[PDB]
Model the fold of this input.
Amino acid sequence: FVNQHLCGSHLVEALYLVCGERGFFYTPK
Amino acid sequence: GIVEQCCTSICSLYQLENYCG
Done:
């Protein structure tokens, strides 16, 4: 599910799913 | 940054994990 264009909430959701307990930083700039 | 890598172009697990804590 990660190998595609991921924008906006779809990108955030992927970060969430992948990073799990590690958390993540989202900086769209 | 992540948008240029995953939104404007195709994402990868490799790149997503660069942003994990």
